[PDB]
């Protein structure tokens, strides 16, 4: 039982005790908890129409939802100064990006086969421009997949360390100054600001990850 695995168990303990453990009013309302997830559920459902809609948007809806839930929960409890968040390695976020891309192509290669190679040439770019575009398009396909995984994990690592580095400075300030007042609450004020940012960025980057993985699904199912 590594730190990753025990954290993953804590994730599911929280997951069930928001909507699965209310289940009593037999209505659409009756608990503000229910309003919370269906708000998120509706934001992604209409987003599923707006990005994947047209033949099978609802077919692939859960993966975007489950991944968004996975990133959302993993980013909620990540601020406490002793948060050894996701083992301080975050290597799986890269792995999630790799498997998401790798599954994306097999779906593309299964549903299109050789036609999947025609995606590198959207509208024009004739034979003189074909090798340049297919190089840019194919390298890009590797490019944003690896970038997606690294950006989320590094910023979580960056946010966690800027918790500690600033915290050590506050310890230095509150120990040296005898009678003055403006030495520690201002560094505490930045700590309050920099923690709100880390909490905020995790919410949108989960959304950004949700939008991005949605965006790549369009390219696999729909050729343009």
């Amino acid at each position: 039982l590594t730190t990753f695995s025990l954290y993953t168990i804590i994730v599911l303990l929280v997951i069930t005790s928001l909507y699965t453990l209310t289940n009593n009013n037999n209505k659409i309302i009756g608990s503000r908890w229910l309003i919370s997830q269906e708000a998120i559920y509706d934001t992604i459902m209409n987003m599923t129409k707006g990005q994947i809609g047209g033949k099978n948007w609802g077919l692939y809806f859960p993966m975007i939802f489950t991944l968004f839930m996975f990133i959302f929960i993993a980013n909620l409890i990540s601020m406490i100064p002793y948060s050894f968040a996701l083992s301080a390695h975050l290597v799986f976020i890269i792995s999630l990006s790799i498997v998401i891309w790798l599954g994306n192509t097999i779906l593309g290669l299964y549903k299109h086969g050789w036609v999947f190679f025609s995606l590198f040439v959207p509208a024009g770019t004739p034979l003189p421009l074909v090798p340049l575009l297919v190089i840019i398009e194919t390298l890009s396909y590797f490019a944003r997949a690896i970038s997606l995984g690294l950006r989320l994990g590094s910023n979580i690592l960056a946010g966690h360390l800027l918790m500690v580095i600033l915290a050590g400075l506050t310890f230095n300030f509150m120990l040296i100054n005898l009678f003055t007042l403006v030495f520690g609450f201002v560094p505490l004020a930045m700590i309050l600001a920099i923690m709100m940012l880390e909490f905020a960025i995790g919410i949108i980057q989960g959304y950004v990850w949700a939008i991005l993985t949605a965006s790549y699904l369009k390219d696999a199912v729909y050729l343009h």
Partner: peptide, 14 residues
């Protein structure tokens, strides 16, 4: 868990 409160107490407990 009934939903009458439905606030941040359970996450505070967590």
């Amino acid at each position: 868990f009934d939903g009458d409160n439905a606030s941040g107490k359970p996450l505070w407990h967590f």
